[PDB]
């Protein structure tokens, strides 16, 4: 029932997340979307469905906040030299080893 | 009399004419005029792409695209079903 | 769940592509081009329908973009001896060995 | 759904014609002409039929265009020993 992606060992039950042996403290919003991405591993994630499931149905806010998240995740977990989350315009974001 | 007017298809024809008028008016004026002058409804001559281009100040390629778009939106289920029974 | 055509493999679910040995990053437009081609492999496609589906219906720009994107593919897909995709004059495009 | 007549095998979806396993590439005009011939095998099609269907109605030119295209199709797929696309003078053409 444990979640993993190569170099990131993700735990929901304990709610701790490990960047390859080192624990990382993350808030729910990102913890949820990170867990969401690993549940549908091997799949690009389009903003529409991101705001749909990972966020609320009634969200009337803007969309660049998705860029704001992927920015914080890049500077927080993806600080490693290799890239685990891949952007691609028009459609969205995938989780994958480089 | 083979050549005689059957007198019941004439009414069908005029009413289908009115229905075609209404369906064409459902679409945009530009596309409706393009199709009208392209199939010869206002007059007897269905003109050519060059003629509709010179009367509408538009390129023949854009005319082809506008015709294809018009046909696609004309394929729409209500128009198709409405016209289908007239056959 | 997976689309196969000769030396062309597409897994739309992982949204990845495999060409006789190696994948290639593809912009949504050209990826949608390829996916529609492999979905209708062996069936010719005319520009009007190809724009209508693979582009948005609201499109009103020029038509040379389709030829330009087919060239974008050709510089990446048709490097082999066989013409994987053919350009049927006055009709459209098709993907067939 | 494959159009056939003895030797000639025309497929719409893949857009080429076979002579008992012999494909040949044809021009679009001639392709429509061959297709709308084959779907009317054994039936006479007159010149107005041909021009109104294969060409558009507004074709304001002279008729020998279809004459030249039938010549093309004859030298292309009739090139076998037997003659299939026969002509009825003053009436039209039939593939048979």
DSSP D2-67: -EEETTEEEETTTTEEEESS-EE---HHHHHHHHHHHTTTTS-EEHHHHHHHTS-TT--S-THHHH
Would you say the C-alpha torsion B28, B33, B35, B41 has a positive or negative sign?
positive
Q: Which chains touch D (3 or more CB pairs under 8 A)?
A: B, C
CA distances from B66 to A55, B43, B48, B76, C85 (A): 40, 21, 14, 16, 27
CA distances from D68 to D16, D30, D55, D96 (A): 21, 10, 14, 19
Long-range contacts of C85-93 (CB under 8 A, 24+ apart): C85/C37, C88/C44, C88/D15, C89/D28, C90/D28, C91/C44, C91/C46, C91/D15, C91/D28, C92/C44, C92/C45, C92/C46, C92/C47, C92/C49, C92/C50, C93/C37, C93/C44, C93/C45, C93/C47, C93/C50, C93/C66
3-state secondary structure string across chain B: CCCCCCCCHHHHHHHHHHHHHHHHHHCCHHHHHHHHHHHCCCCCCCCCHHHHHHHHCCCHHHHHHHHHHHHHHHCCHHHHHHHHCCC
Contact predicate B36/B74, CB 8 Å: no
With an 8 Å Cβ cutoff, is B81 touching chain C?
Answer: no
Determine if residue D46 is left, alpha or beta; phi over 0 gives left, psi from -120 to 50 gives alpha, anything else beta.
beta
* CB contact (8 A) between residue D57 and residue B46: yes
3-state secondary structure of A46: strand
* Residue that has been written with the tokens 């015709």 in this structure: B67
Q: A45 burial class (0-12, 13-18, 19+ CB within 10 angstroms)?
A: buried
Which residue(s) pair with D85 in the sheet?
A: D95
Q: Which of C14, C25, C28 sits opposite A90 (nearest CB)?
A: C28
* CB contact (8 A) between residue D13 and residue C43: yes
- For B35, the token pair is 């199709």
C76 closest CA partner among C14, C1, C26? C26
Determine the length of chain D: 96
Instruction: Residue window 1-60, chain B: list those with CB within 8 Å of chain C.
Output: none
Contact predicate A90/C27, CB 8 Å: yes
N- to C-terminal Cα separation, chain A: 25
CA distances from C95 to B5, B74, C22, C43, C87 (A): 52, 29, 20, 8, 9
Cα A29 to Cα A65: distance, rounded to the nearest angstrom: 12
Chain C: give the shortest CA distance to residue B64, in Å.
9
Contact predicate A84/A7, CB 8 Å: yes
* CB contact (8 A) between residue C42 and residue D15: no
3-state secondary structure of C4: strand
Chain B: give the shortest CA distance to residue D25, in Å.
25
The set of residues, in sequence order, having a beta carbon less than 8 Å from that of A52 and lying 6+ positions away, is none
* Residue that has been written with the tokens 């060239």 in this structure: C71
The set of residues, in sequence order, having a beta carbon less than 8 Å from that of D17 and lying 6+ positions away, is D8, D9, D10, D11, D23, D24, D26, D31, D34, D77
Chain C: give the shortest CA distance to residue B50, in Å.
18
Determination technique used: cryo-EM
- Dihedral over alpha carbons C78, D14, D68, D60 (to 10 degrees): -100
The set of residues, in sequence order, having a beta carbon less than 8 Å from that of C34 and lying 6+ positions away, is C8, C10, C17, C26, C73, C77
* CB contact (8 A) between residue C29 and residue A90: yes
Contact predicate A10/A35, CB 8 Å: yes
Residue D94 has what DSSP assignment?
E
Contact predicate B86/B19, CB 8 Å: yes
* Residue that has been written with the tokens 């939106």 in this structure: B73
| Extended strands (E) in A1-98 | 3-5, 8-10, 17-18, 23-24, 45-46, 85-88, 92-95
- Dihedral over alpha carbons D58, D60, D62, D65 (to 10 degrees): -40
Chain D residues bordering chain C (beta-carbon distance below 8 Å): 13-15, 28
Q: Which residue of D has its CA nearest to B38?
A: D58
Cα A60 to Cα A50: distance, rounded to the nearest angstrom: 14
N- to C-terminal Cα separation, chain C: 22
Cα D46 to Cα D25: distance, rounded to the nearest angstrom: 26
CA distances from A1 to A4, A13, A14, A39 (A): 10, 9, 12, 11
A15 closest CA partner among B30, D6, C91, A30? A30
Interface mutation target, options D55, D57, D59, chain B, most CBs of B under 10 Å: D57
Phi, psi angle pair for A87, to nearest 5°: -80, 150
Cα B80 to Cα C63: distance, rounded to the nearest angstrom: 28
Angle at A15 between CA A11 and CA A21, to 5 degrees: 55
B61 closest CA partner among D7, C63, D84, A46? C63
* Residue that has been written with the tokens 């469905």 in this structure: A49
Phi, psi angle pair for A12, to nearest 5°: -85, -50
Cα B25 to Cα C37: distance, rounded to the nearest angstrom: 36
Cα C94 to Cα C73: distance, rounded to the nearest angstrom: 13
* Greatest Cα-to-Cα distance within chain B, rounded to the nearest angstrom: 49
Cα D50 to Cα D56: distance, rounded to the nearest angstrom: 10
Cβ neighbour number for residue A7 with a 10 Å cutoff: 14
């Amino acid at each position: 029932v444990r979640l993993t992606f190569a170099d990131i060992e993700l735990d929901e039950e304990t709610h701790e997340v490990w960047k390859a042996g080192q624990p990382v403290s993350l808030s729910p919003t990102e913890f949820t979307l990170l867990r969401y991405f690993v549940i549908n591993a091997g799949t690009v994630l389009s903003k529409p469905k991101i705001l749909d499931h990972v966020w609320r149905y009634d969200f009337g806010g803007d969309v660049n906040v998705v860029e704001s998240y992927v920015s914080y995740l890049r500077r927080k977990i993806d600080t490693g030299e290799k890239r685990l989350l891949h952007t691609l315009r028009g459609v969205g974001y995938v989780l994958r080893e480089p | 009399d083979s050549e005689a007017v059957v007198a019941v298809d004439a009414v069908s024809f005029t009413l289908l004419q009115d229905q075609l008028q209404s369906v064409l008016d459902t679409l945009s004026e530009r596309e409706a005029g393009v199709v009208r002058l392209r199939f010869g409804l206002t007059d007897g001559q269905p003109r050519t792409l060059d003629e509709i281009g010179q009367v509408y100040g538009v390129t023949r390629e854009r005319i082809r695209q506008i015709e294809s778009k018009t046909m696609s939106k004309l394929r729409h289920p209500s128009r198709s079903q409405v016209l289908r029974d007239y056959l």
